[PDB]
Amino acid sequence: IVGGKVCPKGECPWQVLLLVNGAQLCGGTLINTIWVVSAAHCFDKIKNWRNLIAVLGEHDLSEHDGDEQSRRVAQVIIPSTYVPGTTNHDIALLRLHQPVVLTDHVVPLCLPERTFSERTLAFVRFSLVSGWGQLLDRGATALELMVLNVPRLMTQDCLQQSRKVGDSPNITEYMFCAGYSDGSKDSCKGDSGGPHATHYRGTWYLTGIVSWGQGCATVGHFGVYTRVSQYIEWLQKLMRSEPRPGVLLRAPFP
Amino acid sequence: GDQCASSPCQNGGSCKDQLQSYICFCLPAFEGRNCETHKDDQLICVNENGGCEQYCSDHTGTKRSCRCHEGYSLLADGVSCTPTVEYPCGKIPILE
Amino acid sequence: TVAAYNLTWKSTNFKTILEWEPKPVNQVYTVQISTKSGDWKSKCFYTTDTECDLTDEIVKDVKQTYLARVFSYPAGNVESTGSAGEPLYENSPEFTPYLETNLGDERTLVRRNNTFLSLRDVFGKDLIYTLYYSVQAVIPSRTVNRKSTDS
Numbered sequence A: 001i002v003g004g005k006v007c008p009k010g011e012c013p014w015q016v017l018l019l020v021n022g023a024q025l026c027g028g029t030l031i032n033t034i035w036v037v038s039a040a041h042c043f044d045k046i047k048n049w050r051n052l053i054a055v056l057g058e059h060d061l062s063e064h065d066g067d068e069q070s071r072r073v074a075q076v077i078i079p080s081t082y083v084p085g086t087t088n089h090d091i092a093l094l095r096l097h098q099p100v101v102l103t104d105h106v107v108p109l110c111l112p113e114r115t116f117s118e119r120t121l122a123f124v125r126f127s128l129v130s131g132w133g134q135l136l137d138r139g140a141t142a143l144e145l146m147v148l149n150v151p152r153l154m155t156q157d158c159l160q161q162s163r164k165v166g167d168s169p170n171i172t173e174y175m176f177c178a179g180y181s182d183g184s185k186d187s188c189k190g191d192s193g194g195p196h197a198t199h200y201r202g203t204w205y206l207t208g209i210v211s212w213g214q215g216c217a218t219v220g221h222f223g224v225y226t227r228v229s230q231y232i233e234w235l236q237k238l239m240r241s242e243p244r245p246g247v248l249l250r251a252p253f254p
Numbered sequence B: 001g002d003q004c005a006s007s008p009c010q011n012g013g014s015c016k017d018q019l020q021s022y023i024c025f026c027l028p029a030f031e032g033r034n035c036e037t038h039k040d041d042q043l044i045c046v047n048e049n050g051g052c053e054q055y056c057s058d059h060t061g062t063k064r065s066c067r068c069h070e071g072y073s074l075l076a077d078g079v080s081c082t083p084t085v086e087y088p089c090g091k092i093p094i095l096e
Numbered sequence C: 001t002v003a004a005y006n007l008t009w010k011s012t013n014f015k016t017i018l019e020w021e022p023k024p025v026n027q028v029y030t031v032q033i034s035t036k037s038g039d040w041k042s043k044c045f046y047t048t049d050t051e052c053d054l055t056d057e058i059v060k061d062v063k064q065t066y067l068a069r070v071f072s073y074p075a076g077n078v079e080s081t082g083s084a085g086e087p088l089y090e091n092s093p094e095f096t097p098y099l100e101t102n103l104g105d106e107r108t109l110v111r112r113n114n115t116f117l118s119l120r121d122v123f124g125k126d127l128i129y130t131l132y133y134s135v136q137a138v139i140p141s142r143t144v145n146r147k148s149t150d151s
């Protein structure tokens, strides 16, 4: 997170940290004791599928205090429309092997109803993005969970304000931009998969997933988030399905 | 309407004449150039979430209904939700 | 759907109306207004009009700068969206009531404790008048619309 602050211990109770063989993979959000949402590209190169773990209650990556819980990830489900290597349909729904326990340091973020999201949350200006990713582009990742408040933009305004090229894909209806164009704040590498949470009348909801961008805090650029409102149907239907016998599952989308 | 002369300000507003133009000083419940819109008649879900704390549903020829997320129950007022669980989602326990 | 154009703010003694074009042909518009760091609030839901009174919102903090946009929906399908799943819209100019409304003891459309405030209650010492040495109201610390007209 570039230009953020430290999320005081416990103020980001839904934050998940995915690890592959002990190494940081991506961030994730907790929607309920056994389901976690992340970004699909985070699994583009996973060949040690049974070495994938999720940590909750995590704050300070160096020391260990009581509060952390680790569970293995039993299944990873990504849209059938995602293409390894791209940024569209960048969502992954993970089924933990056993549930986590909720405590003051482990609480899920509400997954909102599509209409409420599209119609009300989408117009809340600021949401928080968080993680243990780089603190500057190509900089050092963090140790204490960092959080940043970013303003959201409608694509017309994003396309209008962003500078023409770079390895920048299009902004599809499955993405949205939030951030600053003056290169002061943004999400970055290591934050990918993590949350974009919106606060509406006392509760927090999951509106986006950290997905991609031109560098991190690149001038004339904004951060791009997976628009979760477009997958709620899909998520809910999957979280009510019966376990099917694969670790990586590509589920039909729509 | 025409400037003041033709009492353009509806629903109890007062007109003020300007350089041809006029201004209508509407009453608390109406707004609009000519105090024509009733603030009290736009209880729809696209209008400040219908006043619902969490979910809103609009209904044909009948008032909109507010709802809640799993773990929450709708209260008497018809708009607010309270948690019916320990760790209701989207709540931060140390800030509660 | 076509996007509105020429969004303009018409404001006198804080009565603020936004006006735009075109006169719709089978489409409706909704307006959203905000302050740079505030949430957007919608007004004039699915209207065929080309103007939207925003007084109520801008007189909450006349010293803020507001931005507004008008969405265009085909009539019949108020859930129409474009390639990016959002409704077509266009933004207005920014407006800072306090430094841009036009002037004409006089009361304004600014309200406080359910009543209205007056020109001086709002411009206190930024407001002076002229005689020659007829009257005109002037706010010499403005950039635009510094003087009013006469009587």
Ligand SMILES: C[C@@H]1CCCC[C@H]1Oc1cccc(-c2nc3cc(C(N)=[NH2+])c(F)cc3[nH]2)c1[O-]
Residues within 6 Å of the ligand: A025, A026, A041, A042, A043, A044, A045, A186, A187, A188, A189, A190, A191, A192, A210, A211, A212, A213, A214, A215, A216, A217, A222, A223, A224
């Ligand atoms: C963890 C997966 C393993 C497979 C290949 C990509 C890698 O993840 C990444 C590798 C390099 C960069 C990113 C990354 N840069 C990012 C930049 C931004 C931003 N400008 N706001 C962002 F939101 C997410 C990003 N994610 C990233 O998420």
